[PDB]
């Protein structure tokens, strides 16, 4: 751990997301961050909200400039573009000026009961709006400063559900900018290219339900792209996908039936205090292309991944849960589910992502999650997706 000042600076739950504490203005103005790989976007509110408890306020910052252009952003918010100078406590000792949408309209944006009341997005310019002509927050503070062009996030799920004030005093993980904290996870870090430089796109090239091959035209996996996203709760597959694997999860599972609400995310499913039956659920692992020409390695987590920790309806002492694996119609996300089981690498200088076991993953006595390398895999290429 060569980054002790940015370690457990983070906050919050997989249903929630997490958020770094930041200011903006002069004099600084602290305000809680939601940490998104999924956007490119630096907005914070900027305006009264009834979810809000503070905003920015552009009138009493002196080194405030106004862009005098707007930004809509289809939940969806409206802001006025502007500059500001910008700082992270718990992060690296500088001050940038950055892009800022000062968020004045809002809609289903802010949620009840959260803490944030910003959001950064850390994704590439490419998906950036209005145009990639907005400088992404990381750009500018790489630009600016000597900090590596480089961040690791390490998003601790708690196994459990946190209350309204556990939620608050909890440490949620550590964002770690410009570098890697060795004390964050055991074993071999694994990296695989970052295909092109917008989303964090990846490529998987094959899929296992308790070692059990999918055996998908692995095209399927990555249809229409495959993305890594702090900002998503969930582990969302194409439609096809879905389905096969809920297929293979139930057959796995089968010695216990669960309702059609369960598998559709809706509903939750509760077990005696400390009885959950974690064993009769399947790992999953997803084989990513390796750094190395025909070769692979894989990720895998365990149910308690992707079986979120919720609140029973009546705060019972039953243990309850929800299930986190969901359709999408945009592709592979790999969201809050997948990243609480590993620490993961975003190496921007050398376009790659990487993947080791969390130092924070829950398990039990008898499972670990796992990232294991290398696999002999052909044609990996072709798994990519070509509009
Ligand atoms: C390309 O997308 C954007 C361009 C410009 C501005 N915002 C964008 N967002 C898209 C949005 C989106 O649907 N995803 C999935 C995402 N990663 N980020 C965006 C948003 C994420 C959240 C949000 C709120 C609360 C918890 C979690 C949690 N966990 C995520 C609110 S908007 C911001």
Same mark, same amino acid.
């Given at each position: 751990?060569?980054?002790?000042?940015?370690?457990?600076?983070?906050?919050?739950?997989?249903?929630?997301?997490?958020?770094?504490?930041?200011?903006?203005?002069?004099?600084?103005?602290?305000?809680?961050?939601?940490?998104?790989?999924?956007?490119?976007?630096?907005?914070?509110?900027?305006?009264?909200?009834?979810?809000?408890?503070?905003?920015?306020?552009?009138?009493?910052?002196?080194?405030?400039?106004?862009?005098?252009?707007?930004?809509?952003?289809?939940?969806?918010?409206?802001?006025?573009?502007?500059?500001?100078?910008?700082?992270?406590?718990?992060?690296?000792?500088?001050?940038?000026?950055?892009?800022?949408?000062?968020?004045?309209?809002?809609?289903?944006?802010?949620?009840?009961?959260?803490?944030?009341?910003?959001?950064?997005?850390?994704?590439?310019?490419?998906?950036?709006?209005?145009?990639?002509?907005?400088?992404?927050?990381?750009?500018?503070?790489?630009?600016?400063?000597?900090?590596?062009?480089?961040?690791?996030?390490?998003?601790?799920?708690?196994?459990?559900?946190?209350?309204?004030?556990?939620?608050?005093?909890?440490?949620?993980?550590?964002?770690?900018?410009?570098?890697?904290?060795?004390?964050?996870?055991?074993?071999?870090?694994?990296?695989?290219?970052?295909?092109?430089?917008?989303?964090?796109?990846?490529?998987?090239?094959?899929?296992?339900?308790?070692?059990?091959?999918?055996?998908?035209?692995?095209?399927?996996?990555?249809?229409?792209?495959?993305?890594?996203?702090?900002?998503?709760?969930?582990?969302?597959?194409?439609?096809?996908?879905?389905?096969?694997?809920?297929? $293979?999860?139930?057959?796995?599972?089968?010695?216990?039936?669960?309702?059609?609400?369960?598998?559709?995310?809706?509903?939750?499913?509760?077990?005696?205090?400390?009885?959950?039956?974690?064993?009769?659920?399947?790992?999953?692992?997803?084989?990513?292309?390796?750094?190395?020409?025909?070769?692979?390695?894989?990720?895998?987590?365990?149910?308690?991944?992707?079986?979120?920790?919720?609140?029973?309806?009546?705060?019972?002492?039953?243990?309850?849960?929800?299930?986190?694996?969901?359709?999408? $119609?945009?592709?592979?996300?790999?969201?809050?589910?997948?990243?609480?089981?590993?620490?993961?690498?975003?190496?921007?200088?050398?376009?790659?992502?990487?993947?080791?076991?969390?130092?924070?993953?829950?398990?039990?006595?008898?499972?670990?999650?796992?990232?294991?390398?290398?696999?002999?895999?052909?044609?990996?290429?072709?798994?990519?997706?070509?509009?």
């Amino acid at each position: 751990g060569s980054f002790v000042e940015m370690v457990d600076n983070l906050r919050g739950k997989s249903g929630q997301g997490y958020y770094v504490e930041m200011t903006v203005g002069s004099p600084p103005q602290t305000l809680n961050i939601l940490v998104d790989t999924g956007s490119s976007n630096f907005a914070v509110g900027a305006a009264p909200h009834p979810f809000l408890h503070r905003y920015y306020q552009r009138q009493l910052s002196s080194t405030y400039r106004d862009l005098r252009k707007g930004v809509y952003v289809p939940g969806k918010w409206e802001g006025e573009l502007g500059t500001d100078l910008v700082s992270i406590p718990h992060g690296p000792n500088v001050t940038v000026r950055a892009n800022i949408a000062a968020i004045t309209e809002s809609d289903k944006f802010f949620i009840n009961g959260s803490n944030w009341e910003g959001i950064l997005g850390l994704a590439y310019a490419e998906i950036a709006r209005p145009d990639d002509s907005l400088e992404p927050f990381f750009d500018s503070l790489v630009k600016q400063t000597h900090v590596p062009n480089l961040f690791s996030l390490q998003l601790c799920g708690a196994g459990f559900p946190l209350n309204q004030s556990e939620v608050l005093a909890s440490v949620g993980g550590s964002m770690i900018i410009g570098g890697i904290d060795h004390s964050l996870y055991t074993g071999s870090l694994w990296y695989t290219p970052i295909r092109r430089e917008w989303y964090y796109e990846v490529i998987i090239v094959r899929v296992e339900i308790n070692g059990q091959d999918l055996k998908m035209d692995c095209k399927e996996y990555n249809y229409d792209k495959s993305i890594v996203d702090s900002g998503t709760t969930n582990l969302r597959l194409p439609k096809k996908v879905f389905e096969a694997a809920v297929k $293979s999860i139930k057959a796995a599972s089968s010695t216990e039936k669960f309702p059609d609400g369960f598998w559709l995310g809706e509903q939750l499913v509760c077990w005696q205090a400390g009885t959950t039956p974690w064993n009769i659920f399947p790992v999953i692992s997803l084989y990513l292309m390796g750094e190395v020409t025909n070769q692979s390695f894989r990720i895998t987590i365990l149910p308690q991944q992707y079986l979120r920790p919720v609140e029973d309806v009546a705060t019972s002492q039953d243990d309850c849960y929800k299930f986190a694996i969901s359709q999408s $119609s945009t592709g592979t996300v790999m969201g809050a589910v997948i990243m609480e089981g590993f620490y993961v690498v975003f190496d921007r200088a050398r376009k790659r992502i990487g993947f080791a076991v969390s130092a924070c993953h829950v398990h039990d006595e008898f499972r670990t999650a796992a990232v294991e390398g290398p696999f002999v895999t052909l044609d990996m290429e072709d798994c990519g997706y070509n509009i």
